[PDB]
Design a protein around this nucleic acid. Structure first.
Ligand SMILES: Nc1nc2c(ncn2[C@@H]2O[C@H](COP(=O)(O)OP(=O)(O)OP(=O)(O)O)[C@@H](O)[C@H]2O)c(=O)[nH]1
Ligand SMILES: [Mg+2]
Lengths: 196, 49, 102, 171, 229, 454
RNA sequence: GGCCCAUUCGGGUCUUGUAAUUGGAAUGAGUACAAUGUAAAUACCUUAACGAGGAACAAUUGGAGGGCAAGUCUGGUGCCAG
């Protein structure tokens, strides 16, 4: 087990860089919800802020900063889905990315373009969120496309990123069980410092 | 994986006709002749010791 | 054309009932077609179509045969008494839903 | 199954080449599986020879082993001796599979035609359609390998290609 | 989770039915659910055996006693009204509950081993049995381990079988549980291994206790009918 | 001694398995199952009926009224009869004709009623194996079977069809093909007092049908040559025999399981058994059956054996080696082609090429004590089975049937102690499957009826 | 013309090839009627309809060796060597 201990203790070592993020009052972590036009986003930002702050925030606009932890607060904003320019800007400044994927349609070039722009400008943390799981009667094809989306997402982010599965929308927004443990995934993310 | 071994066995048993002389099944029709030549100088037989 | 075979027919006077095992035979058909099977069972035995019932269907591999469990009643009222409520929901007339809470 | 001792010597490679080509096998795992359990069989029969005559183990397990080997069909009815179990080998075992047997009975034109007939379900031993090619038919199921009655090579209704061509030629 | 006496197949379930309290003990009885449902199979599940218990077909010991876990112990004559089912259940030779079918003149009574005779209160002689039928006034010569015959319409003792050397005895208990033949030997010790010993096909010998044995008749004439093979 | 050690160790083994008559002998599970047996219904079809008609020596034999009604049909093949609880009979030929008879006029020859003749008109216009739904026979009808209730006769042959005809008009009500290329039917038997037919088809297959529902019940597989004969009684068991695999199987048809019975007579041990002090030998092909009762049956072989088999013994209980004689050897003017009788006698090799007659028809009267065997020896034989059911014995012969006997069965008359039967036997000059038969010695294509009495 | 052997010269052998055309059969993944199963639903089992030519309905991984330019670089006893 000594060779295992050496080969595992080796991959703790990384390039020692500075942090430059304070520990007393850190800024609210910028969460960017990124999707092609027609999936999640609004409904998703509304559901997350309703679970987080007990406040029905109908008709969102702009960045939305809420407190979601004892010391972690975070800022919600949404890219306009047609603009590559706003896509590029929030790729360059976002810290967490909720990557909306229409799981019925599949992968799409807007989320692929965001993934490549982020990968070249300093890849932030990415949690993929696959919606539209109303495929057919076939729970078999639900599971098949589930696995295929997870593997294709794993080739674009590190192998072992989190793809999250949202069920159908019920009464204007998502199921609060799913949004509860989605916020449980957002609450532990352990951000690492970028360079730019 | 199956068609590859079907077509590398057909290649192998076409190469086997080159090294040995393969029993093809006997005389087909009328004995036409040797069809390829008769060498009177070559003896392809294994001598002892 | 489906084919029917009853085997091991016993009588239960305590439950006012006659029960047996049902070899159902459908060469080049899909399966048992349970309502049509209750029709065929109710005409091979006496009338009592809302008092004949089958529940335990297992088709063997490759089709053709299926073994079920057949029980036929006299007196449709006492059949309604003695049969369970889920089979009554499946076949007959009863429908009471459970209160959906917690 | 289990891999052999020296898996890459040239005699073994030409061996597997001849076996896979002569029996239409897909990879090495067919040979290795059937040879692994044949190794268990004749490794047992070796010990049954190393014990003596009138040993209870030898008498009962020997006639048991040769009778169930005869009923699998790799051993003929007259050789009821225990040294023929040692003379047994791997192609005596994979001549018994259904692909080999369909081709030898002549329902197919080659072992590859036999493999695709079996995997397209045109072949039924007895009552059930068998659909895997490595089936190890027995000496009683040897003569009921025939075309399935659910199949156009039996007597059934012709398939989608034939009926679509018939419909388009009727148009 | 089952005993050995019930003849219970293992492919049945997980929870075994504990009998409720009643006449006999837990360890020497079978309830009605394990009787009717999975032994002679008048039911298929607990719901319909409760259904026929609510219909009240059972007439064990001449009373109805509608209960699922009612502990029918030794020779309680189970009576079922439809198809005049009269069942006296005794022990077989390998420990189970062999339920013999009898007729009406035999199910009109039962018998019971007397346990103790008491001068309880107000000058009343007194007798108990394995179902606890406290019936009034037997003769003074009722020793322990004799056999009363209950009336089963009223409760009175009708006949009496005296326990002595040369009586046909039934053994329910210990490693002799369920044997018949009652004569090779008599040996009353002073506190244990005390009994009358029982023959076999080759007239072998056996040891038991007094309380684990009780008389059913005479050498050739028991008025109980017994099953055979 | 190794087989002695095998027997000894097997005996010790069974003793140890027993290890792992008293006055009380009752077992709880047995008596509980007997209570369920008292509870159940249908003690009707499943009688394990033993031999309850012990009358073999009783009736007369030697003075039967034998009428050989010759008919003008080449090579009659089968015979089907009927009795309710007027009697009709049925014959069928290689000339593609079914013929209905009345037989109930017992003291005289049968009476022709109705033809039904297929021919070249009924060849299907497809040559395709599942549109074989024509209304007549175009090739070689091999077997007829009358219903036990008498609504239908059902027949079939080498055109791989089952045509079920009505009785009152001889009309084809329904056609059921056997859906494959080799599916020629060779034997048909209804189970008694029923509407269920058991056909034995040359695909090593046994098909079963319900005739009044026009449905097929179950196909059951397992012989190794063509299933040359079939037999059934009131039970849902059946007994088939395939030809050259030398085994007879009996089928629990609901369970779809079987009991096999192989032959196994060897001239080495048989000639040694005679050598302890002889022209008898091994076996060719088990050919015909009839289930005598629900525990025994009898098989007719290709070397003239008649064998009696139980339900509880693999090897047969009783044999009878030569049952119709050995054939007349080919003449010296038709063996050799030399001039002198010495060389033409040397071309007979003595006794080495004398072949026995093969029993081509066997009929056990159901549950009775007597069965009838027939071949082309010219004389039917009647045998009775002894009352201990471990042997049979030749009673007498019925010598008015010149030709091959392609079918035997009997027709009953008279009450419980006084009885008379007419034995029908289809007589041809050619075996019912192929030709193969030379030296046609005065044969005629007829119906040999005999009236036996007392 | 392909193939095989061999350090060399050479030797041994034989129906073998081709992004050549072409033909009708087969069905399986998939898409799906159902019924069965089951408290109910899933799944197994049974199963009509559609479903192949780049059968594109588009399996990988690793290895061995070339060949090319009005191209580029280095060396130096022309046109070469690398
Ligand atoms: N069936 C289904 N519909 C959904 C789901 N999520 C969102 N929608 C629908 O998506 C519709 C489009 O509005 P939004 O989802 O807010 O659109 P968006 O994702 O913000 O994208 P933009 O239109 O570009 O702003 C809504 O009216 C929802 O009904 C889901 O999981 N299932
Ligand atoms: Mg939006």
């Amino acid at each position: 087990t000594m060779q295992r201990s050496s080969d595992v203790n080796e991959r703790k070592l990384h390039v020692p860089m500075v942090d430059r993020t304070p520990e007393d009052d850190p800024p609210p972590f910028i969460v960017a919800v990124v999707g092609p036009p027609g999936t999640g986003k609004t409904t998703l930002i509304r559901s997350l802020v309703r679970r987080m702050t007990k406040s029905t925030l109908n008709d969102i606009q702009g960045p939305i900063t809420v407190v979601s932890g004892k010391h972690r607060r975070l800022t919600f904003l949404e890219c306009p889905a047609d603009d590559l320019n706003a896509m590029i800007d929030i790729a360059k400044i976002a810290d967490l990315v909720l990557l909306l994927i229409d799981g019925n349609f599949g992968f799409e070039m807007e989320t692929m373009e965001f993934l490549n722009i982020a990968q070249h400008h300093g890849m932030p943390r990415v949690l993929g969120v696959a919606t539209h799981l109303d495929l057919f009667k076939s729970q078999s094809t639900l599971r098949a496309s589930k696995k295929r989306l997870k593997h294709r997402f794993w080739t674009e982010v590190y192998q072992g990123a989190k793809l999250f599965y949202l069920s159908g929308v019920i009464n204007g927004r998502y199921p609060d069980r799913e949004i509860l443990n989605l916020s449980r995934f957002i609450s532990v993310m352990k951000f690492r410092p970028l360079k730019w | 994986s199956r068609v590859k071994k079907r077509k590398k066995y057909q290649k192998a048993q076409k190469k086997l006709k080159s090294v040995r002389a393969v029993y093809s099944g006997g005389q087909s029709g009328v004995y036409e002749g040797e069809k390829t030549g008769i060498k009177k100088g070559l003896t392809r037989s294994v001598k002892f010791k | 054309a489906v084919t029917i075979r009853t085997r091991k027919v016993i009588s239960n006077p305590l439950l006012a009932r006659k029960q047996f095992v049902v070899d159902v035979l459908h060469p080049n058909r899909a399966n048992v077609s349970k309502d049509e099977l209750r029709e065929k069972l109710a005409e091979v035995y006496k009338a009592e179509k809302d008092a004949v019932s089958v529940f335990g269907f297992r088709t063997q591999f490759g089709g053709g045969k299926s073994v079920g469990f057949g029980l036929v009643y006299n007196s449709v009222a006492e059949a309604k008494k003695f049969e369970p409520t889920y089979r009554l929901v499946r076949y007959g007339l009863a429908e009471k839903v459970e209160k959906a809470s917690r | 199954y289990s891999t052999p001792k020296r898996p890459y010597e040239s005699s073994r490679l030409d061996a597997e080449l001849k076996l896979a080509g002569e029996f239409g096998l897909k990879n090495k795992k067919e040979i290795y599986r059937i040879s692994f359990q044949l190794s268990k069989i004749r490794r047992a029969a070796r010990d049954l020879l190393t014990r003596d005559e009138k040993d209870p183990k030898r008498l009962f397990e020997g006639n048991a082993l040769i009778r169930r080997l005869v009923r699998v069909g790799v051993l003929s009815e007259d050789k009821k001796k225990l040294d023929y179990v040692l003379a047994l080998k791997v192609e005596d075992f994979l001549e018994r599979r259904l692909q080999t047997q369909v081709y030898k009975l002549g329902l197919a034109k080659s072992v590859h035609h036999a493999r695709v007939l079996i995997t397209q379900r045109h072949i039924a031993v007895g009552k059930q359609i068998v659909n895997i090619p490595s089936f190890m038919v027995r000496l009683d199921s040897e003569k009921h390998i025939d075309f399935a009655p659910t199949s156009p090579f039996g007597g059934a209704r012709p398939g989608r290609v034939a009926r679509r061509n018939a419909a388009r030629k009727a148009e | 989770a089952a005993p050995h006496h019930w003849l219970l197949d293992k492919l049945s379930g997980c929870y075994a039915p504990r009998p409720s309290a009643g006449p006999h003990k837990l360890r020497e009885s079978l309830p009605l659910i394990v009787f009717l449902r999975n032994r002679l199979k008048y039911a298929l599940n607990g719901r319909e055996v409760k259904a026929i218990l609510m219909q009240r077909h059972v007439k064990v010991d001449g009373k109805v006693r509608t209960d699922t876990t009612y502990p029918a112990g030794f020779m309680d004559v189970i009576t079922l009204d439809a198809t005049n089912e009269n069942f006296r259940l005794v022990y077989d030779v390998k420990g189970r509950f062999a339920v013999h079918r009898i007729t009406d003149e035999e199910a009109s009574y039962k018998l019971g081993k007397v346990k103790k005779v008491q001068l309880g209160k107000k000058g009343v002689p007194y007798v108990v049995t394995h179902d606890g039928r406290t019936i009034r006034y037997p003769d003074p010569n009722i020793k322990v381990n004799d056999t009363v015959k209950i009336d089963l319409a009223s409760g009175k003792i009708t006949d009496f079988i005296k326990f002595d050397a040369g009586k046909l005895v039934y053994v329910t208990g210990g490693r002799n549980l369920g044997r018949i033949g009652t004569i090779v030997h008599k040996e009353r010790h002073d506190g244990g291994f005390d009994l009358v010993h029982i023959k076999d096909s080759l007239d072998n010998t056996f040891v038991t206790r007094l309380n684990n044995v009780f008389v059913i008749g005479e050498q050739g004439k028991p008025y109980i009918s017994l099953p055979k093979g | 001694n190794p087989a002695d050690k095998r027997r000894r160790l097997a005996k010790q083994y069974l003793e140890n398995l027993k290890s792992e008559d008293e006055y009380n002998n009752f077992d709880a599970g047995d008596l509980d199952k007997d209570i369920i047996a008292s509870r159940l219904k249908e003690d009707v079809a499943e009688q394990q009926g033993r031999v309850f008609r012990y009358f073999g020596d009783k009736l007369l034999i030697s003075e039967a009224k034998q009428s050989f009604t010759r008919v003008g049909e080449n090579n009659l093949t089968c015979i089907s009869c009927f009795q309710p609880v007027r009697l009709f009979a049925y014959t069928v030929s290689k000339d593609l004709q079914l013929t209905k008879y009345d037989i109930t006029d017992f003291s005289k020859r049968p009476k022709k009623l109705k033809y039904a003749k297929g021919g070249a008109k009924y060849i299907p216009t497809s040559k395709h194996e599942y549109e074989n739904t024509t209304e007549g026979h175009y090739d070689e009808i091999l077997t007829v079977a009358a219903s036990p209730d008498g609504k239908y006769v059902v027949t079939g042959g080498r055109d791989r069809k089952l045509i079920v005809w009505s009785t009152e008009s001889l009309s084809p009500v329904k056609v059921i093909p056997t859906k494959d290329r080799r599916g020629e039917v060779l034997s048909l038997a209804f189970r008694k007092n029923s509407d269920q037919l058991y056909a034995s088809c040359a695909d090593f297959k046994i098909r079963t049908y319900s005739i009044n529902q026009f449905s097929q019940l179950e196909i059951l597989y397992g012989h190794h040559d063509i299933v040359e004969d079939i037999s059934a009684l009131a039970m849902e068991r059946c007994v088939t025999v395939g030809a050259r695999d030398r085994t007879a199987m009996l089928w629990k048809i609901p369970d779809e399981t079987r009991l096999t019975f192989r032959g196994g007579d060897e001239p080495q041990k048989l000639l040694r058994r005679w050598m302890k002090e002889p022209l008898f030998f091994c076996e060719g092909s088990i050919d015909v059956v009839s289930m005598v009762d629900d525990f025994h049956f009898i098989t007719g072989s290709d070397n003239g054996n008649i064998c009696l088999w139980s339900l509880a013994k693999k090897k047969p209980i009783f044999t009878e080696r030569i049952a119709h004689g050995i054939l007349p050897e080919p003449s010296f003017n038709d063996i050799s082609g030399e001039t002198d009788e010495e060389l033409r006698k040397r071309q007979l090799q003595g006794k080495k090429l004398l072949q026995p007659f093969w029993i081509t028809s066997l009929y056990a009267i159901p549950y009775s004590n007597v069965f009838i065997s027939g071949s082309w020896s010219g004389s039917l034989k009647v045998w009775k089975i002894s009352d201990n059911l471990r042997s049979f014995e030749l009673l007498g012969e019925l010598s008015g049937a010149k030709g091959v006997v392609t079918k035997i069965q009997v027709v009953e008359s008279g009450k419980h102690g006084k009885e008379k039967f007419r034995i029908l036997a289809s007589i041809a000059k050619e075996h019912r499957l192929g030709r193969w038969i030379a030296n046609v010695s005065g044969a005629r294509n007829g119906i040999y009826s005999a009236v036996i009495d007392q």
